[PDB]
Amino acid sequence: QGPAKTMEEASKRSYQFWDTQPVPKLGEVVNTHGPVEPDKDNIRQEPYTLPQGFTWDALDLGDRGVLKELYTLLNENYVEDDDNMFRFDYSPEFLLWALRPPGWLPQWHCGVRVVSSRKLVGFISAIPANIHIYDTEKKMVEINFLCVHKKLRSKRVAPVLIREITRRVHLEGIFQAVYTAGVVLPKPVGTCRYWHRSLNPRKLIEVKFSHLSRNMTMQRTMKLYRLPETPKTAGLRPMETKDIPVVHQLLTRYLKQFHLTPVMSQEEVEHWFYPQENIIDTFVVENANGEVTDFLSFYTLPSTIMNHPTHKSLKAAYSFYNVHTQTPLLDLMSDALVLAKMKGFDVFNALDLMENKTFLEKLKFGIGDGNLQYYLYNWKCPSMGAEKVGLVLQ
Amino acid sequence: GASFSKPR
Ligand SMILES: CCCCCCCCCCCCCC(=O)SCCNC(=O)CCNC(=O)[C@H](O)C(C)(C)COP(=O)(O)OP(=O)(O)OC[C@H]1O[C@@H](n2cnc3c(N)ncnc32)[C@H](O)[C@@H]1OP(=O)(O)O
């Protein structure tokens, strides 16, 4: 009845819900490419039944009060590290960025409330995304922010949330989805791992996010992670409106080399990369000819430090999409670290996907304890190595 | 992506 972190531990587990879903079995190897089941031509019109005393409510995130209720649900009940020491603390303005990209739909912001008190106790979301998977491009959704209030857990409310968002996506004619999780489910198309780059090692060690390496003093740890005060790449500057087309061009061409990627329109590129303070940072390299040849980006996602008397929060930057054509990726990411340090971040996180393994050890990242499993719903295809995953979710 | 990691 409890989740699994490893593929061998998950293989002895029973998946009463996921056995009912159009996903491959954990045990079988996938030899084909295509949908698990044909598209449905008649879709259930009625919402799935919730347990007595709870009701569906679609959340208007343009209402400041409602957005704050969602902030609070996530702030108090969303994903923790496996030791229950830190919890994601997505900000209201970040949530609006992640949940209202181009094509967002109100019915896909799927809340659960207590009938009597109106308290928000559950959420799940879908946003539309065009996804390139091996040799197929298809319209899908990305599922994120699945959250059940701690007091409502282990009562089969999450399967109801999954079925209800599935139904609402089916009604719009979409039959595939992509999603990620730290737990093992049937069946990962790719397995990634977070790595962490200390920026403020003293704070990270004090709050036990990080620990002193074997036979290393704090003084040595400070010198080890020390960074230059300014970046080194010539012509590095924040992305501006005039850069939207070339950033779209660079990204589109760069992503062709991977096997699971988004296909963004120019409007989606504007949404996902145009800088917004405390949400998304994008820096381009404009060379001596005035041409933009590279860019780096990272998003802002702090965590709550639970039950700590002094340090309440950790400011974390997450590597987003980094595109190099003239500047070495190593130099780009070195400058990303310098920029994050300048902007007050305590740690810089990056997955081992795309080409990130080429710089992780060199730039003094340390391996994390969390896997990031990538999944497709209703799509059969062979799994891929982390290096071929070219998709980053919020 | 619904996975909270910290260094091993
Ligand atoms: C065509 C369109 C399709 C669209 C839909 C595509 C699918 C989208 C799928 C969702 C993508 C989410 C992507 C991102 O949001 S990952 C975000 C997950 N959120 C959190 O971890 C927040 C903190 N935790 C919680 O709020 C709850 O513990 C959750 C909600 C996770 C489970 O609540 P609870 O603890 O009360 O569990 P239950 O008794 O209600 O039900 C347990 C059943 O559900 C299975 N379970 C547990 N965790 C997950 C999970 N993270 N994804 C999918 N399934 C999960 C579980 O193995 C069991 O199934 P089986 O073991 O019996 O088989």
Coordinates of N, CA, C and O and ligand atoms in Angstrom, one line a residue, chain A residues 1-4 13-23 74 77-80 87 121 123-126 140-150 152-163 165-170 174-186 372 375-378 393, chain B residues 1-3, ligand 1:
Chain A
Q1 N 0.8 -1.2 0.0 CA 0.0 0.0 0.0 C 0.9 1.3 0.0 O 0.3 2.4 0.0
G2 N 2.2 1.1 0.0 CA 3.1 2.2 0.1 C 4.0 2.3 -1.2 O 4.2 1.3 -1.9
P3 N 4.5 3.5 -1.4 CA 5.3 3.7 -2.7 C 6.7 3.0 -2.6 O 7.1 2.5 -1.6
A4 N 7.3 3.0 -3.8 CA 8.6 2.3 -4.0 C 9.6 3.3 -4.6 O 9.2 4.1 -5.5
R13 N 6.0 -5.3 -5.7 CA 4.9 -4.5 -5.3 C 3.7 -4.8 -6.2 O 3.8 -5.2 -7.3
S14 N 2.5 -4.6 -5.6 CA 1.2 -4.7 -6.4 C 0.7 -3.4 -6.7 O 0.7 -2.4 -5.9
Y15 N 0.2 -3.2 -8.0 CA -0.3 -1.9 -8.5 C -1.8 -2.0 -8.8 O -2.1 -2.1 -10.0
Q16 N -2.6 -2.1 -7.8 CA -4.0 -2.3 -8.0 C -4.6 -1.2 -8.9 O -5.5 -1.5 -9.8
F17 N -4.2 0.1 -8.8 CA -4.7 1.1 -9.6 C -4.0 1.1 -11.0 O -4.7 1.1 -12.0
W18 N -2.7 1.0 -11.0 CA -2.0 1.2 -12.3 C -2.2 0.0 -13.2 O -2.1 0.1 -14.4
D19 N -2.5 -1.2 -12.6 CA -2.9 -2.4 -13.5 C -4.1 -2.1 -14.3 O -4.3 -2.7 -15.3
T20 N -5.0 -1.2 -13.9 CA -6.2 -0.9 -14.6 C -6.0 0.2 -15.7 O -6.9 0.4 -16.5
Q21 N -4.8 0.8 -15.8 CA -4.6 1.9 -16.7 C -3.8 1.5 -17.9 O -3.2 0.4 -18.0
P22 N -3.9 2.3 -19.0 CA -3.2 1.9 -20.2 C -1.8 2.3 -20.2 O -1.3 3.3 -20.8
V23 N -1.0 1.6 -19.4 CA 0.5 1.8 -19.3 C 1.1 0.4 -19.3 O 0.5 -0.6 -18.9
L74 N -0.4 23.4 -1.4 CA 0.9 22.8 -1.8 C 2.0 23.1 -0.7 O 2.8 22.2 -0.4
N77 N 1.3 20.5 2.0 CA 1.0 19.1 1.8 C 1.7 18.5 0.5 O 1.4 17.4 0.2
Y78 N 2.6 19.3 -0.2 CA 3.2 18.8 -1.4 C 4.4 18.0 -1.1 O 4.7 17.6 0.0
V79 N 5.3 17.8 -2.1 CA 6.3 16.8 -2.0 C 7.4 17.2 -1.0 O 7.9 18.3 -1.0
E80 N 7.8 16.2 -0.2 CA 8.9 16.3 0.7 C 10.1 15.5 0.3 O 9.9 14.5 -0.5
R87 N 10.3 20.7 2.1 CA 9.0 20.5 1.3 C 9.1 21.6 0.2 O 9.5 22.7 0.5
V121 N -8.5 20.6 -0.3 CA -7.9 19.4 0.2 C -7.3 18.6 -0.9 O -6.6 17.6 -0.6
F123 N -5.7 18.5 -5.3 CA -5.5 19.2 -6.6 C -4.8 18.3 -7.5 O -4.1 17.4 -7.1
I124 N -5.0 18.5 -8.8 CA -4.2 18.0 -9.9 C -4.4 18.9 -11.1 O -5.4 19.6 -11.2
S125 N -3.4 18.9 -12.0 CA -3.5 19.8 -13.1 C -3.0 19.2 -14.4 O -2.2 18.2 -14.3
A126 N -3.5 19.7 -15.5 CA -3.0 19.3 -16.8 C -2.7 20.6 -17.6 O -3.5 21.6 -17.5
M140 N -0.2 16.2 -26.4 CA -0.3 15.5 -25.1 C -0.7 16.5 -24.0 O -0.9 17.7 -24.3
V141 N -0.9 16.1 -22.8 CA -0.8 17.0 -21.7 C 0.3 16.6 -20.8 O 0.8 15.5 -20.8
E142 N 0.8 17.6 -20.0 CA 1.7 17.3 -18.9 C 0.9 17.4 -17.6 O 0.2 18.4 -17.3
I143 N 1.0 16.4 -16.7 CA 0.3 16.3 -15.5 C 1.3 16.7 -14.4 O 2.4 16.3 -14.4
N144 N 0.8 17.6 -13.4 CA 1.7 18.1 -12.4 C 0.8 18.5 -11.2 O -0.4 18.6 -11.3
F145 N 1.5 18.7 -10.1 CA 0.9 19.3 -8.9 C -0.2 18.4 -8.3 O -1.2 18.8 -7.7
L146 N -0.1 17.1 -8.5 CA -1.0 16.1 -7.8 C -0.7 16.2 -6.3 O 0.4 15.9 -5.9
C147 N -1.8 16.6 -5.5 CA -1.6 16.8 -4.1 C -2.9 16.4 -3.4 O -4.0 16.9 -3.7
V148 N -2.7 15.6 -2.3 CA -3.8 15.3 -1.4 C -3.4 15.8 0.0 O -2.3 15.5 0.4
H149 N -4.3 16.4 0.7 CA -4.1 16.9 2.0 C -3.6 15.7 2.9 O -4.2 14.6 2.8
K150 N -2.7 16.0 3.8 CA -2.1 14.9 4.6 C -3.2 14.2 5.4 O -3.1 13.0 5.6
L152 N -6.1 13.5 4.4 CA -7.0 12.7 3.5 C -6.2 11.6 2.8 O -6.8 10.9 1.9
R153 N -5.0 11.3 3.2 CA -4.1 10.4 2.5 C -4.6 8.9 2.8 O -5.3 8.7 3.7
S154 N -4.1 8.0 1.9 CA -4.3 6.6 2.0 C -5.8 6.2 2.0 O -6.2 5.2 2.6
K155 N -6.6 7.1 1.4 CA -8.0 6.9 1.2 C -8.5 6.8 -0.2 O -9.6 7.1 -0.5
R156 N -7.5 6.5 -1.1 CA -7.8 6.3 -2.5 C -8.4 7.5 -3.2 O -9.1 7.4 -4.2
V157 N -8.0 8.7 -2.7 CA -8.4 9.9 -3.4 C -7.5 10.2 -4.6 O -8.0 10.8 -5.6
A158 N -6.2 9.9 -4.5 CA -5.4 10.1 -5.7 C -5.8 9.4 -6.9 O -5.8 10.0 -8.0
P159 N -6.2 8.1 -6.9 CA -6.7 7.5 -8.1 C -8.0 8.2 -8.7 O -8.2 8.2 -9.9
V160 N -8.8 8.8 -7.8 CA -10.0 9.5 -8.3 C -9.6 10.8 -9.0 O -10.1 11.1 -10.1
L161 N -8.6 11.5 -8.4 CA -8.0 12.7 -9.1 C -7.4 12.3 -10.5 O -7.6 13.0 -11.4
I162 N -6.7 11.2 -10.5 CA -6.1 10.8 -11.8 C -7.1 10.5 -12.9 O -7.1 10.9 -14.0
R163 N -8.2 9.7 -12.5 CA -9.2 9.4 -13.4 C -10.0 10.6 -13.8 O -10.4 10.7 -15.0
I165 N -8.9 13.8 -14.0 CA -8.2 14.7 -15.0 C -8.1 13.9 -16.3 O -8.2 14.6 -17.4
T166 N -8.0 12.6 -16.3 CA -7.9 11.8 -17.5 C -9.2 12.0 -18.3 O -9.2 12.3 -19.5
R167 N -10.4 12.0 -17.6 CA -11.6 12.2 -18.3 C -11.7 13.6 -18.9 O -12.1 13.8 -20.0
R168 N -11.3 14.6 -18.1 CA -11.4 16.0 -18.6 C -10.4 16.2 -19.8 O -10.7 17.1 -20.6
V169 N -9.3 15.5 -19.8 CA -8.4 15.6 -21.0 C -9.0 14.9 -22.2 O -8.9 15.4 -23.3
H170 N -9.5 13.7 -21.9 CA -10.2 12.9 -23.0 C -11.3 13.8 -23.7 O -11.5 13.7 -24.9
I174 N -7.6 14.5 -26.3 CA -6.2 14.2 -26.1 C -6.1 12.9 -25.3 O -6.8 12.7 -24.3
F175 N -5.2 12.0 -25.8 CA -5.2 10.6 -25.2 C -3.9 10.1 -24.7 O -3.7 9.0 -24.4
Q176 N -2.9 11.0 -24.7 CA -1.6 10.7 -24.1 C -1.2 11.8 -23.2 O -1.6 12.9 -23.2
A177 N -0.3 11.4 -22.2 CA 0.2 12.4 -21.3 C 1.6 12.1 -20.9 O 2.1 10.9 -21.1
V178 N 2.3 13.0 -20.4 CA 3.7 12.8 -19.8 C 3.7 13.4 -18.4 O 3.0 14.3 -18.1
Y179 N 4.4 12.7 -17.5 CA 4.4 13.1 -16.1 C 5.7 12.5 -15.5 O 6.3 11.6 -16.1
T180 N 6.1 13.0 -14.4 CA 7.3 12.6 -13.6 C 6.9 12.3 -12.2 O 5.9 12.9 -11.7
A181 N 7.7 11.6 -11.5 CA 7.6 11.3 -10.1 C 8.9 10.8 -9.5 O 9.7 10.3 -10.2
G182 N 9.0 10.9 -8.2 CA 10.1 10.3 -7.5 C 9.9 8.9 -7.1 O 10.9 8.2 -6.7
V183 N 8.7 8.3 -7.3 CA 8.4 7.0 -6.9 C 8.4 6.2 -8.2 O 8.2 6.7 -9.3
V184 N 8.6 4.9 -8.1 CA 8.5 4.0 -9.3 C 7.1 3.5 -9.5 O 6.4 3.0 -8.6
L185 N 6.6 3.7 -10.7 CA 5.3 3.2 -11.2 C 5.4 2.5 -12.5 O 6.5 2.6 -13.1
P186 N 4.4 1.7 -12.9 CA 4.4 1.2 -14.3 C 4.2 2.4 -15.2 O 3.2 3.1 -15.1
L372 N 14.3 11.0 -10.6 CA 13.1 11.6 -11.3 C 12.8 10.6 -12.4 O 13.5 10.5 -13.4
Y375 N 7.5 9.3 -17.3 CA 6.4 8.4 -17.7 C 5.6 8.9 -18.8 O 5.4 10.2 -18.9
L376 N 5.1 8.1 -19.7 CA 4.1 8.4 -20.7 C 2.8 7.6 -20.3 O 2.9 6.4 -20.0
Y377 N 1.7 8.2 -20.5 CA 0.4 7.5 -20.3 C -0.2 7.2 -21.7 O -0.2 8.1 -22.6
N378 N -0.5 5.9 -21.9 CA -1.1 5.4 -23.1 C -0.1 5.6 -24.3 O -0.5 5.9 -25.4
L393 N 10.3 19.5 -16.6 CA 9.0 19.9 -16.0 C 9.3 20.8 -14.8 O 10.3 20.8 -14.1
Chain B
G1 N 9.2 18.6 -10.7 CA 8.7 17.3 -11.2 C 8.2 16.3 -10.2 O 8.3 15.1 -10.4
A2 N 7.7 16.8 -9.1 CA 7.2 16.0 -8.0 C 8.3 15.0 -7.4 O 7.9 13.9 -7.0
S3 N 9.6 15.4 -7.4 CA 10.6 14.6 -6.7 C 11.5 15.6 -6.0 O 12.2 16.4 -6.6
Ligands
LIG1 C1 -4.9 11.1 -21.4 C2 -4.7 12.0 -20.2 C3 -4.1 11.2 -19.0 C4 -3.8 12.1 -17.8 C5 -3.4 11.3 -16.6 C6 -2.0 10.7 -16.7 C7 -1.6 10.0 -15.4 C8 -1.2 11.0 -14.3 C9 -0.8 10.3 -13.1 C10 -0.4 11.2 -11.9 C11 0.9 11.9 -12.2 C12 1.3 12.8 -11.0 C13 2.6 13.6 -11.4 C14 3.1 14.6 -10.5 O1 2.0 15.4 -9.9 S1 4.1 13.9 -9.2 C15 3.3 14.7 -7.7 C16 2.9 13.8 -6.6 N1 2.5 14.6 -5.4 C17 3.1 14.4 -4.2 O2 3.9 13.6 -4.0 C18 2.6 15.4 -3.1 C19 2.7 14.7 -1.8 N2 1.9 13.5 -1.8 C20 0.6 13.5 -1.9 O3 -0.1 14.5 -2.0 C21 -0.1 12.1 -1.9 O4 0.7 11.2 -1.1 C22 -0.3 11.5 -3.3 C23 -1.4 12.4 -4.0 C24 1.0 11.5 -4.1 C25 -0.9 10.1 -3.2 O5 -2.1 10.2 -2.3 P1 -2.2 9.0 -1.2 O6 -0.9 8.8 -0.5 O7 -3.4 9.3 -0.4 O8 -2.5 7.7 -2.1 P2 -4.0 7.1 -2.4 O9 -4.3 6.2 -1.3 O10 -4.9 8.3 -2.6 O11 -3.7 6.3 -3.7 C26 -2.6 5.5 -3.9 C27 -2.6 4.9 -5.4 O12 -2.1 6.0 -6.3 C28 -0.7 5.7 -6.6 N3 0.3 6.9 -6.5 C29 0.9 7.3 -5.4 N4 1.6 8.4 -5.8 C30 1.4 8.6 -7.0 C31 1.9 9.6 -7.9 N5 2.7 10.5 -7.4 N6 1.5 9.7 -9.2 C32 0.6 8.7 -9.6 N7 0.2 7.7 -8.8 C33 0.6 7.7 -7.5 C34 -0.3 4.7 -5.5 O13 0.9 3.9 -5.9 C35 -1.5 3.8 -5.5 O14 -1.6 3.1 -6.8 P3 -1.4 1.5 -6.9 O15 0.0 1.5 -6.2 O16 -2.5 1.0 -6.1 O17 -1.3 1.2 -8.3

